[PDB]
Design a protein around this ligand. Structure first.
Ligand SMILES: O=C(O)c1cc(-c2ccc(CNC(=S)c3ccc(-c4ccc(C(=O)O)o4)cc3Cl)cc2)n(-c2ccc(Cl)c(Cl)c2)n1
Length: 123
């Protein structure tokens, strides 16, 4: 309801990427989901997520959760709680968050819009 950004864990993106906080169970909004390029393997999805202050596209989904995307329960605009995630740092220094467990709290259809005015996070 009122003040929609109050429904999101403002500051969680910075906490994850800066402080190395992996204990939080932040509530984030999905802004976009797209497949990455895969070959002979299960598909893999990349997500642009928002905590209300920042967006960040450095997220990929555990493949065990693919059905959430493919059956449309996890889609752009939905609000989700991340129950478990890990971080992998690439050779070039970029960090990637792999979402291992998450819960859809509000469906995309029940939210319907990007919440707030988040700006891209600068790693
Ligand atoms: O084509 C593409 O477009 C493509 C490609 C990729 C891509 C990049 C890096 C990697 C390296 N693989 C890593 S970062 C990774 C590590 C662990 C897991 C993991 C643990 C448990 C599970 C599971 O249960 O599924 O998965 C997964 C990954 Cl993917 C891979 C792809 N990227 C890419 C580029 C930059 C970023 Cl910030 C992101 Cl989110 C994705 N784009």
């Amino acid at each position: 309801g009122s003040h929609m950004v109050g429904q999101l864990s403002r500051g969680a993106i910075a906490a994850i990427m800066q402080k190395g906080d992996t204990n939080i169970k932040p509530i984030l909004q999905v802004i976009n989901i797209r497949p990455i390029t895969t070959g002979n393997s299960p598909p893999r999805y990349r997500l642009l997520m928002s905590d209300g202050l920042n967006t960040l596209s450095s997220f990929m989904l555990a493949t065990q959760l693919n059905p959430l995307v493919e059956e449309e329960q996890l889609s752009s605009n939905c609000v989700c709680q991340i129950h478990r995630f890990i971080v992998n740092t690439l050779k070039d220094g970029r960090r990637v968050v792999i979402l291992m467990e998450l819960e859809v709290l509000k469906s995309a259809e029940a939210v319907g819009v990007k919440i707030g005015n988040p700006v891209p996070y600068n790693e």
